[PDB]
Symmetry: D5
Subunit: 156 residues, 10 copies
Amino acid sequence: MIQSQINRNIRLDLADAILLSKAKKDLSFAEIADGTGLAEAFVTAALLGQQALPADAARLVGAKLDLDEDSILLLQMIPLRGCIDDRIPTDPTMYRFYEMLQVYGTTLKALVHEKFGDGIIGAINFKLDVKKVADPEGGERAVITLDGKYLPTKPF
Amino acid sequence: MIQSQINRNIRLDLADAILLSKAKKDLSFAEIADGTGLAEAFVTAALLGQQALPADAARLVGAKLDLDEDSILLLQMIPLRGCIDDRIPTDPTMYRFYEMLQVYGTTLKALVHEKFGDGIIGAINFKLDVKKVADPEGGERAVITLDGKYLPTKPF
Amino acid sequence: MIQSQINRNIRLDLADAILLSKAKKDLSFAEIADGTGLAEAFVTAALLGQQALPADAARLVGAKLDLDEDSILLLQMIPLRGCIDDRIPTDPTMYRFYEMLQVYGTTLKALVHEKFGDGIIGAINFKLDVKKVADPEGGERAVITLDGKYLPTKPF
Amino acid sequence: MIQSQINRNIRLDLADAILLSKAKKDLSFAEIADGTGLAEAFVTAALLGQQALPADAARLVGAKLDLDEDSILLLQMIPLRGCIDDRIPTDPTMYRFYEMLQVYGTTLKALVHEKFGDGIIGAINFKLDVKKVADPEGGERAVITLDGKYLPTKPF
Amino acid sequence: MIQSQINRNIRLDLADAILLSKAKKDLSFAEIADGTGLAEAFVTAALLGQQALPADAARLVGAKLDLDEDSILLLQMIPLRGCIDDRIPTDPTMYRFYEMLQVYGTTLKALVHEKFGDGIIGAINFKLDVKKVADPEGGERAVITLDGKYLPTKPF
Amino acid sequence: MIQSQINRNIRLDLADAILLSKAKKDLSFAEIADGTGLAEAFVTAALLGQQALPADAARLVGAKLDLDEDSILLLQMIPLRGCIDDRIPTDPTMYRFYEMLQVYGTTLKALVHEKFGDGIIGAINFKLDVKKVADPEGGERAVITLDGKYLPTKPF
Amino acid sequence: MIQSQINRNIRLDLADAILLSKAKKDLSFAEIADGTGLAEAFVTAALLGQQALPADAARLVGAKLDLDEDSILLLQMIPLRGCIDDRIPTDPTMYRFYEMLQVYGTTLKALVHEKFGDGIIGAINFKLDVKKVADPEGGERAVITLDGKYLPTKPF
Amino acid sequence: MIQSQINRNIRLDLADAILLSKAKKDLSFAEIADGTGLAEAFVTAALLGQQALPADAARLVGAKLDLDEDSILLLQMIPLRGCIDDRIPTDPTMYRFYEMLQVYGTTLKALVHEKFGDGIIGAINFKLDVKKVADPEGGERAVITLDGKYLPTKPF
Amino acid sequence: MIQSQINRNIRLDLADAILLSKAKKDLSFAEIADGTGLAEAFVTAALLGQQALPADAARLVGAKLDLDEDSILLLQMIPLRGCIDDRIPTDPTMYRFYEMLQVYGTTLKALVHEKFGDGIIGAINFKLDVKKVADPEGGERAVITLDGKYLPTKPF
Amino acid sequence: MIQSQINRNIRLDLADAILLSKAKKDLSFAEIADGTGLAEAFVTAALLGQQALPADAARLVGAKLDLDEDSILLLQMIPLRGCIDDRIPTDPTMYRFYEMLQVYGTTLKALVHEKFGDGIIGAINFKLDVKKVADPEGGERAVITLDGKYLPTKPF
Ligand SMILES: [Br-]
Ligand SMILES: [Br-]
Ligand SMILES: [Br-]
Ligand SMILES: [Br-]
Ligand SMILES: [Br-]
Ligand SMILES: [Br-]
Ligand SMILES: [Br-]
Ligand SMILES: [Br-]
Ligand SMILES: [Br-]
Ligand SMILES: [Br-]
């Protein structure tokens, strides 16, 4: 039977334990997700308290990280989602994504309405991924693709 | 000589005026940006107070919208950036992008550090585009590409 | 061509003007919506800056309220939605709905996940109505129906 | 003698404990509330710290969940209500109901005053229920019914 | 037909105009409410944007303060209530009432549950009054009386 | 020697302990305050962390509640007052008193100034009581008496 | 008849006007207060929107600053007090006084309770003043004296 | 070697331990400071986490209060200063000081500039004392002396 | 006689007028500060409302910018300082300086206490300059110098 | 394999532990950093939770401070950066740097755009140092140098 959380702290405390075990074992997120059938972004978000793992995946990652039974069960719960401590991120790496919204938020809205119409680009029927692409001018670029379904707003 | 702003309301007031003109003329953002040499996301962001237009572009769009001269000069000024009224958007269309950050923010962090290293994906050496495509399962999707240069943090 | 707003104050200012006009004419929202072929709750939300009217409806209600042309055009723009002045309502009528969330929010989460699964009940593919029902103990009840589509969150 | 709480964390810490027990026994909210004589939404809300159970219901659910006597006692206390961590929910599921308020709050006020008069629709003399309904176009809809007593505001 | 406001600033601006006239005419709130049939506290709350006056009171106070027709009409609208500028009062006189809540809020909760049971003391079915008394140790006391109906919360 | 507190959580934690003990003994606040020579609202506020008890009363309530010596000592300390978690109450019961201030705060200011003059109605030279009263219409009312000394602001 | 304000902005705007006129006339606060019979701190506070002037003083200072009739009347109104824009001052000169509270607020509480008892040092029956005193180690010192009446909190 | 703190909670927790020991020993702040060669406000502020004690003073108050070595060492650390829990005090005793800034903040700014010049009255080169004295009209007053060095801002 | 402001918007509105004038004349800040005898950062800060100009400098920059007499007078007033709209900048260019504080603020505190002692590095007895240098890896760097006097905190 | 944190409190608790060990051993940050090959500001920042140490450095500092293996591992993790407890520092030493931004932030923006162009001075490609320089008028000056790379914003 499906089970859900209401206090994000239970899963976020579990995330810190996971990250410690991960480091002690010198593991990567790619390796933790490999063999699971699930995308690296999905498995990683689950570890970090933002998604639920199916049971088989919870056991698979529990074994890799030496987690206890309560922990494997907790990973299967539907989380109380929200990873930002206090609305605005303090961390530079996360903050950049917030700043992209401060710069282009209204442009995303205007261009969505133009291309699709009234409504939203969904954050539920959605996936994201991060690809590394060499920069012609030197160094590396990240192309983050946000991929979401258009949900129209219509009169009733 | 480059000229900059310190109070966002001046450019945001101009954005409202530009939108009224645009609606009166029943123009699209794609049409406004056409012939400009610049990406629709870039030019649109300028209209909306978040970027500076080169004089040539400003003149072009200023013609299209019948702007007065103070308006065409204002569009060339470097803006006081920040399109969100009070930190967290209230508009559902803009909110979904904020929600991506609440669900995937710590995952983006974790995976940027894994794929690139310590540091950030930049929001200045950065490009944005929005594509409408059909969803294989039915209806329409947005593919939004956040294209940013990796900037490492290294000891000193 | 579709047109959108980015500053809520343009449509909220129009809303106050509409409200004065309406009062002077001693009209109801029921009567304003009459003949539009659109629900009272939809047309009302439009006048109040939270939905866009199609041109024909905009011209009908403009007629009823003696709106000028710029106003009628504005009513057709996709709004920058968000009707609450500063996140938490101060008005008792509005506040009671916020208190429903403070009391039942986690219960709505839990029971949604139990009945439907992981994901959300949407606010976009969504309809709302308000019905007055006699209370059998004496007085009147409001039955407010929130009718939203289930959007699953599945692994990928 | 009736007993009441003043710090929400006691009962929210209990709710976390309850949820772990529930997960361990693979129970549903529907099963927990069976035999109680009380609505699923009311019993769930009590488990989650937002309502008080009568003593018989408290003993029933305590038995189902293997709760100690202090926990069974606590469930009977009148709580310090407020389930949202920090005013605006982070969780998408909970957030959609907040967004309904940001889009429709003022329409709700408008239409309540039109249909009933000055005053409020109550959140205390109040019932709430969640029903799953097939969507004609495919998939599932939630019909959430808010049912509140009208309390008029009159001159004195 | 009943008319309602959604933006408090329309009535609060009217309030300021009312106060200026009141000052210019050297009137008291006592005098302004004379002849209306309505308590001082209720009429005052109206002038200040927190209650609606019946048509006949609106005309009476309007004539006293030399208000235009639009202002007299506005006073009859059901307000968007909330007098405090930004949640916590800065003014010492108002602040004392908020401090009473900071000292006695939990005590009021506890004693309300003890005496009446689960639920609330209402702010709708409610009145207040301010009375002056001599202090037997010198000077004067205000006895502010809050009189609200008990509304029970019961299981369903 | 008088002793005082600087972190409210010490006394608030004590209050939760008191409330568990009270509930276990099925005690009322009225019965706890009996024999102290002090008003119900005063003793209750002390238990809840918002007043100091004299030694004798501290010993007496501690006897009835089975409190340890450190706890009886804590009840005699002058508290760091402020019972509200985060400025605005979440709990419906407490919230209604905040809403009274949102609806009537400026009226209270206005009528205080008219009846008494410039200055404040004190919250320190102050007493509070809660009286349950038959409602002639059926049901019950709370008459909450706020009895405060007027403190004038005079030029200097 | 006493008259009071409810929106600080009316008197704060007037304060800006007064400061412009003062500057054009190259006047000091010392000379504006001279002749009124009122302390410089009181008269200054009044000009700045935080006290009311009696009629004769309002007329005197109005003559000195060439204020119009409505401005002279506004100065006699009991203000909606609160001079800080948004709770925490930005201005360094004002901020130092807030920092004194952040460093010594709890020490002030502790020592007031030790020296006087439970209760407060009042801010109504209160005067303050700023004296320049040569610093024996070179430079100048401000001695700011805060002088307030002790109001005891006693059991009832 | 000088040592310093970055998280206020270490020293604030230590403050609560100190206050319990002080209450248990029935000590005053006056007598704890006796023999340190240091002012009662300075030593008190140290105990409360807002200043650093020299080693000799730390040992002396340490022996009076029976503190362990880690505690005595912590007292010598340069603190992460800021005694207010969440910017605005809730405690009435501390609040009055904040209210003095809300009423007289801009007056203090204006008079400091007039009497001293452009700059600040510092909170670092600064001393504070609290005196109890009779009020000529009856009762008791506090004379709180804020004694700080004027620091000019000069052009560069 | 020295003159001061209490509402930042008077000088910020003047700043926006200055910047429109400066842009029409295609002036640089370096040119405007030329011949004033004052550092470009000092004069610029003054134009932007954060410092006061001496009378001769005010006249000079006012000649260059074609400012009227009231505007020239306003530049000589001691400002209500505070350039950040709402505590945390939204503009990326300004935000980066805030991020330096989020990353290095506690390091700064630690290294100041180690190198100088307990106290502060002043922001009043202070100068600032921005220098453009070549980046030896290619591109350009800013060397921004914060030059402030150490002010110790010593026991008393 | 790189390892990253998501909750700042893990590393901040570590910092408090480090600080106590450091105090006990009477060590300086200068000397902790010695032997490390990394700048005092960088190493100090790492100890305080704002930078990651390479493995050799982590072992070296870990041996000086008597840290356990888990702590030495945690120091190697990429941090969730943000040292300020709640956006605006309370500590006077840290606050001065915030105040510098309140006084000079718009000047920094203005001059950066003038000298370099549209874009930012970076806080990732960035170093800082603190130098003591005797004030020739007496005492000591801290010269804090901020050195960041210019990142242009260009059209695309
Ligand atoms: Br969605
Ligand atoms: Br960047
Ligand atoms: Br949705
Ligand atoms: Br209600
Ligand atoms: Br109510
Ligand atoms: Br008081
Ligand atoms: Br007071
Ligand atoms: Br200072
Ligand atoms: Br300073
Ligand atoms: Br950067």
